Design a protein around this ligand. Sequence first.
Ligand SMILES: *[C@@H]1O[C@H](CO)[C@@H](O)[C@H](O)[C@H]1NC(C)=O
Ligand SMILES: *[C@@H]1O[C@H](CO)[C@@H](O)[C@H](O)[C@H]1NC(C)=O
Ligand SMILES: *[C@@H]1O[C@H](CO)[C@@H](O)[C@H](O)[C@H]1NC(C)=O
Ligand SMILES: *[C@@H]1O[C@H](CO)[C@@H](O)[C@H](O)[C@H]1NC(C)=O
Ligand SMILES: *[C@@H]1O[C@H](CO)[C@@H](O)[C@H](O)[C@H]1NC(C)=O
Ligand SMILES: *[C@@H]1O[C@H](CO)[C@@H](O)[C@H](O)[C@H]1NC(C)=O
Lengths: 166, 47, 320, 208, 49
Amino acid sequence: VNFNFNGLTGTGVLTESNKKFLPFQQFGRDIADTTDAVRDPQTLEILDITPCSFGGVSVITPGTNTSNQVAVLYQDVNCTEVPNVFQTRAGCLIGAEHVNNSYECDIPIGAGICASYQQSIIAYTMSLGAENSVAYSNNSIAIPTNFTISVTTEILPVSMTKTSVD
Amino acid sequence: IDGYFKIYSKHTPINLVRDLPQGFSALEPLVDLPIGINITRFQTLLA
Amino acid sequence: CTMYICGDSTECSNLLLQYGSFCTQLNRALTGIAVEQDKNTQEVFAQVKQIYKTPPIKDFGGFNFSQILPDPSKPSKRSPIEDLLFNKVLICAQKFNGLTVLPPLLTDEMIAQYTSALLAGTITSGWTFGAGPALQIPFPMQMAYRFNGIGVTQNVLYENQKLIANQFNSAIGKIQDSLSSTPSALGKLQDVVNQNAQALNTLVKQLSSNFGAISSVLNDILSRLDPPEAEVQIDRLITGRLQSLQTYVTQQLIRAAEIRASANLAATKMSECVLGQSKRVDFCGKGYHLMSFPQSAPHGVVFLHVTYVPAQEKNFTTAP
Amino acid sequence: KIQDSLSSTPSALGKLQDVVNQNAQALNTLVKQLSSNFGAISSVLNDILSRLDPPEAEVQIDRLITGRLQSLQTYVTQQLIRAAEIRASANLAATKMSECVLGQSKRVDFCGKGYHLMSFPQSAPHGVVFLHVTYVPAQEKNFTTAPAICHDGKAHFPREGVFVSNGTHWFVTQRNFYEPQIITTDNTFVSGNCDVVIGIVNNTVYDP
Amino acid sequence: CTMYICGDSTECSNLLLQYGSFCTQLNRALTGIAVEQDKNTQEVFAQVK
Ligand SMILES: *[C@@H]1O[C@H](CO)[C@@H](O)[C@H](O)[C@H]1NC(C)=O
Ligand SMILES: *[C@@H]1O[C@H](CO)[C@@H](O)[C@H](O)[C@H]1NC(C)=O
Ligand SMILES: *[C@@H]1O[C@H](CO)[C@@H](O)[C@H](O)[C@H]1NC(C)=O
Ligand SMILES: *[C@@H]1O[C@H](CO)[C@@H](O)[C@H](O)[C@H]1NC(C)=O
Ligand SMILES: *[C@@H]1O[C@H](CO)[C@@H](O)[C@H](O)[C@H]1NC(C)=O
Ligand SMILES: *[C@@H]1O[C@H](CO)[C@@H](O)[C@H](O)[C@H]1NC(C)=O
């Protein structure tokens, strides 16, 4: 709701507070020095005031060379309040079907969720890089036999267009 | 100050005979008096 | 920029839009910063192809490591000493003015998974896993490889291996006691968390700063001023608050540059001190570097560097 | 593979395309601030001087110049921070150039992913491309190990390698490549005895 | 900030106080710079016990 409590204005969700206000004191502030509690002016209930949940929207997509199907990310917004919905710590992601198979991260979402296109768009719990139980023991040694030579290109900036803005 | 004559009071237990206690208390506001007066002197009334 | 400066105000946001692309370069810069932290984190911890796991029987050649490696005992896959570091080292209140915190791609449990996998990789593979597939190797021969690398013969390790194991375990206990007792011991991490807490707390107090305006509070300015006067007072607020945000972002970019240099140093130390044996003297801690251990920390890493340090002195005469 | 991967995949050169693109966006963004109003009656400088007279223009233009100067100051300061990042990358590039290109580094994972052998510079628009030739282990083989060798009651340690458990013919091989060689005094050394180390398997050594 | 911008002026310093913490972060940053040179000098030269 949009609230106006004795001149204090904002938009948010009103909940019951358990703070023991003394009789002449009407409202409180946090470390940020912004209002976070109000005494209702008509009935003497102590209320906590918080704003409504919001966050940025990221678009999960394969390139337009491949498909026009997308998934929508509501970052740190609870599913219930939103109106293939998957609840995760980062929020509710709508339009991608959640699967149990972890894969390499393609489009990262955050808080452990990555998405990829496999065809359709899927959402999954992120792999940290497949899985490999190493056969470790106190008396086991592995030694590479045949080797391969790989060349990896690592690019470092050296210069910039030498602009000069008079 | 600035149009308010502000009076504070606090009621607490004490256990000293001859001094001010150690410990902390804060004086709450009771009433805000809308009197723009210039106060510079006072006297204590005893019975 | 739009929500922080002209929060829940279409008219103010439209006035802010008259400054062109500042919102696209500040939001692009901060998005780049967030991506930069995911990239630096991925350079330090997600630098290993696969997730290696230790066996159920933690027989690591007589060197106990149950202190630094996660314990199934905690519900979280977190270590006990590392758990002490996490306990030793508002978010709604911050969010409420449009200054939100984005979750890491890798959760604290996933940071624990990388530090456990990377640390397990170091223990079970020496330096070969950082250059390809993981070999298995017992930890005392790994100590022999690292001593040979630092120019110290293997026989000192093997002859006093029980004493070195006892000194290492006692040293770990010293870390446990020093970090639990001494609050300033973690000053290098406490200062980064403190600088970020001060940067955000300072930014919110600047949201409490007036900057020359009739009022510091944006909802009251829109409730008190009509557009003809409001345009001048909001322009004053945009200049002051936008410069304050520009200063915040500039501090984050310069501090990010210092953190980036530290992250390059941390990744270099990770690879060369943790995933290898460095021959660079006093580069990886004070002494002759043997190995290093990653530990998860809030928004950071703690390295336990095992170093060789001469103790007792003895004089001899020499000749060229 | 480099020719085909880079020719096919446009994002393969993303780190350089991104640096050139960031500089292009910084310049294009600067021009969009020249197209930005900042609160002024008009964004076009020629139109402002063609439009306003000195007695009102000095105060109104002083306000417009003030705003555009903060925008240019922001560009240059932000450009200084980015330049510091390219400068740091350049310091990394010069160090990588000297020890990885003009030498051989023993720093693991410093000069590319694998064991660094050499690099080749390539010219690139306003940047450099390094072709790093690295040694990377491929195929796996399991062996049993031992911490030390007890030959005549003395503990023998390798100078350079690791012992391989064929099963009846233990051999030592260099750390990064399986190539078993006979255990000799020319590739091992003797120091102390076998009675203190836990787990020695007391196999045989040869005295060439 | 007070001395450089509103040097030996209480009225100007009081006007300056309307910008909140900019002087606390500028003086803190520059103090950090001074501490930073002492820390860097101590790492380069005071590296021996
Ligand atoms: C969403 O709301 C329900 C009840 O309102 C709550 O049980 C659930 O935990 C919430 N989701 C999150 C992620 O907190
Ligand atoms: C995926 O995982 C959830 C939770 O473990 C499980 O309930 C579900 O049956 C799994 N499989 C599919 C096909 O969703
Ligand atoms: C090693 O692997 C390569 C594949 O790149 C192969 O061509 C070569 O014959 C192999 N050599 C041996 C000795 O296995
Ligand atoms: C593990 O550490 C504890 C110290 O808490 C020690 O008592 C125990 O012996 C160690 N375990 C092994 C197998 O060495
Ligand atoms: C072990 O050494 C013998 C030498 O007699 C050799 O013939 C054999 O190929 C080696 N490897 C195995 C697995 O037996
Ligand atoms: C070699 O080890 C065996 C263990 O089975 C032991 O019985 C034997 O005495 C050892 N030989 C020497 C020469 O120490």
